Amino acid sequence: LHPIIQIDRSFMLLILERSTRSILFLGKVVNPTEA
Amino acid sequence: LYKMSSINADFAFNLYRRFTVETPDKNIFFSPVSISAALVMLSFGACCSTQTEIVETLGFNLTDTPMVEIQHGFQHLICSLNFPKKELELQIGNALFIGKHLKPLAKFLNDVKTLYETEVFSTDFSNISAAKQEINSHVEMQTKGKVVGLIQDLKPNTIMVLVNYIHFKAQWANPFDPSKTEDSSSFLIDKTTTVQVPMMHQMEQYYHLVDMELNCTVLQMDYSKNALALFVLPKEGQMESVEAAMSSKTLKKWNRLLQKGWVDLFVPKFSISATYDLGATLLKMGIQHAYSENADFSGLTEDNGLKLSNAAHKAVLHIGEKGTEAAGAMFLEAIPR
Ligand SMILES: Cc1cccc(Nc2ccccc2C(=O)O)c1C
């Protein structure tokens, strides 16, 4: 009965620190094997 | 702090949108906090319109938050991010490489050292190549080997370099089991094209949601202490409209709506890296006088002898079964005024 989440196409990523509510890193992965 | 971090978030997203115009349909990866920290530090020594422009480009309004509150907020921010936390590595620091013949105000030096942890190095920029290696090596060391070769080219007349570096390493609250990782799974890179990536797989409870306005799935994976990752997965062909909506207001909404529940979750194992020449971008966004021959950094040196010439960022990311390791570094170059 559980939703499937498949990160299998382009996605945005945020890495956040909780106490300061800072965005440490921000990005979009279009091609995770690129370069 | 949160009203600061909210302005810092909207700067992040505005800059992100500039990048999706400069390098479109390509990987984007940066540390907004690294870029903001470096520029705020550059503002500490600036005066008048030079200082005003920098912080306004950073997204602050000097009526709502006077210059001193901004300075004090960023000092408390860096201090907080660096505070020792169990089971999470996070360090953001900076270094000022000062030309042998510059006249830095010992005020500005003592204050960056004591208030932003700044490390100060007298640098022989008459050996431009050796100086470049020294800075690059310092950044590599401070990012635990992850940011290599930050400065590709360094102008022969450089007389100051300001560097900021951030390193992050953390374990997922719920690590993936590598025996359940699929060696080769499809990832759609455009309408009709796939690449093969390792796909990690876990069945656990996660905070997640479907944003019904924006038509994207938001998935939160916590790190074991004080940090989280948000994955934002648009419906097919909806990425531009999600990008246009990203903002602090949107993050606040998701913070409210995210609900924990069971998920059958597949996440790719991968690494990326990105580099940005930020010179022209920053001029456009409103940082003008800092580049001109009438730049006012009278808080920095006795003779106000310098101007900004170049700026660049490099960031790298690795996500695997155990957690995430990420790093970034910001580079601001000054030459004679
Ligand atoms: C606006 C903003 C900016 C940076 C971090 C936060 N915090 C979150 C935003 C969305 C989802 C989760 C969080 C969180 O830190 O729990 C917020 C609300």
Which residue in B has a C-alpha nearest to residue A1's C-alpha? B262
CB contact under 8 A, B5 and A18: no
Distance CA B58, CA B314 (A): 19
Per-residue HEC secondary structure of B7-27 comes to HHHHHHHHHHHHHHHHCCCCC
Residue pair B108/B300 in contact (Cβ under 8 Å)? The answer is yes
- The burial class, CB within 10 Å (0-12 / 13-18 / 19+), for B88 is middle
> Where exactly are the structural domains of chain A?
1-35
Using most ligand atoms within 8 A of CB, pick from A20, A21, A24, A26 the residue to mutate for ligand 1: A21
Atom of ligand 1 nearest to the CA of A16: 5
Question: Do the strands A4-6 and B259-268 form a parallel or antiparallel pair, or are they unpaired?
Answer: parallel
Q: Judge whether A18 is annotated as a binding position.
A: yes
Q: Is B252 in the pocket of ligand 1 (CB under 6 A)?
A: yes
* Among the partner residues B9, B206, B272, nearest to A23 by beta-carbon distance: B9
**Beta-carbon contacts of residue B307 (< 8 Å; ≥ 6 apart):** B290, B291, B292, B293, B295, B297, B334, B335, B336, B337
B183, two tokens: 């060696």
Q: Which helix (H) or strand (E) holds B171?
A: strand B160-171
**Beta-carbon contacts of residue B266 (< 8 Å; ≥ 6 apart):** A4, A5, A6, A7, A8, B182, B185, B199, B200, B201
Structural domains in chain B?
Answer: 1-172+269-337 (3.30.497.10), 173-268 (2.30.39.10)
CB contact under 8 A, B266 and A6: yes
Note the helical H segments in B163-220.
Answer: none
Amino acid occupying residue B52: T
Of all protein residues, the one whose alpha carbon is nearest to atom 12 of ligand 1 is B255
Q: Which of B284, B285, B328, B291 is nearest to B306 (CA)?
A: B291
Experimental method: X-ray
Atom of ligand 1 nearest to the CA of B230: 11
Distance CA B273, CA B136 (A): 17
Distance CA B167, CA B92 (A): 6
CB contact under 8 A, B227 and A5: no
Yes or no: domain A1-35 corresponds to CATH 2.10.310.10: yes
Count of alpha carbons within 13 Å of B177, Cβ hemisphere only?
A: 5
